[PDB]
Amino acid sequence: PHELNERQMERRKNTCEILLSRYKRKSFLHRIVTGDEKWIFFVKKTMLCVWWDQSGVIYYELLKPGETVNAARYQQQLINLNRALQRKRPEYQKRQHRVIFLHDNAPSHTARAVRDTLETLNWEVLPHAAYSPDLAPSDYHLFASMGHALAEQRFDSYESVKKWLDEWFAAKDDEFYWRGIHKLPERWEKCVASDGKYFE
Numbered sequence: 001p002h003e004l005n006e007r008q009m010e011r012r013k014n015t016c017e018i019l020l021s022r023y024k025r026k027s028f029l030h031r032i033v034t035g036d037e038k039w040i041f042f043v044k045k046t047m048l049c050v051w052w053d054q055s056g057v058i059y060y061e062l063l064k065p066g067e068t069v070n071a072a073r074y075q076q077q078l079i080n081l082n083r084a085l086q087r088k089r090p091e092y093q094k095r096q097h098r099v100i101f102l103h104d105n106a107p108s109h110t111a112r113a114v115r116d117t118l119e120t121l122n123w124e125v126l127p128h129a130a131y132s133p134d135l136a137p138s139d140y141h142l143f144a145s146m147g148h149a150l151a152e153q154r155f156d157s158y159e160s161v162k163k164w165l166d167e168w169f170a171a172k173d174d175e176f177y178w179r180g181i182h183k184l185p186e187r188w189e190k191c192v193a194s195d196g197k198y199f200e
């Protein structure tokens, strides 16, 4: 979409080198939990806030129409996400494993109270470059598939959106979610080979 400047390409390329070199030393893809926000329009619009891993959607919220994510809201979301994670992913209840968290750096995602919450949860937060939805599984995989399916829908209500999302998420095979995460290394490689430009 955007015309990347030098600082932006540098940061993309450097981030991807770091993630890729880590990956080659010891793959960590199975420990990533990732998420992002997207507007869904009906009749007005509601923000979908969703988090997922290679096994499926862990937790989501659909905010009241017009409502936005601010710092306080994101902090509570992360807390609620962690409760869902304990219930749905045993490997993490048992603290056999540490969560690796991939989200973008929207201001609410980096505010002081949110940084504190992440420190306390003690999730590892992966680096992520500005203007890089091609590096964010929610964008290049989850919402890319969703957007096509949404384009046919004309939702009557907030309830219709929620129903549709429950159904849609659940109809995807485990393989869909796994592919979206495990696409990361190829994309990190492409980005390093483009010196940080966008790529096909």
Ligand SMILES: Cc1nnc(C(=O)NC(C)(C)c2nc(C(=O)NCc3ccc(F)cc3)c(O)c(=O)n2C)o1
Residues within 6 Å of the ligand: 001, 002, 036, 037, 104, 105, 106, 107, 129, 130, 131, 132, 133, 139
């Ligand atoms: C940086 C920066 N500035 N604009 C952007 C950007 O990438 N915008 C566009 C609209 C492309 C975009 N954005 C977000 C997103 O969250 N943007 C909020 C945000 C703003 C600043 C910041 F540092 C990080 C995040 C998406 O999720 C997304 O899918 N897209 C497509 O990146």
Ligand SMILES: [Mn+2]
Residues within 6 Å of the ligand: 036, 037, 104, 106
């Ligand atoms: Mn975003």
Ligand SMILES: [Mn+2]
Residues within 6 Å of the ligand: 036, 037, 038, 133, 138, 139
């Ligand atoms: Mn996005």
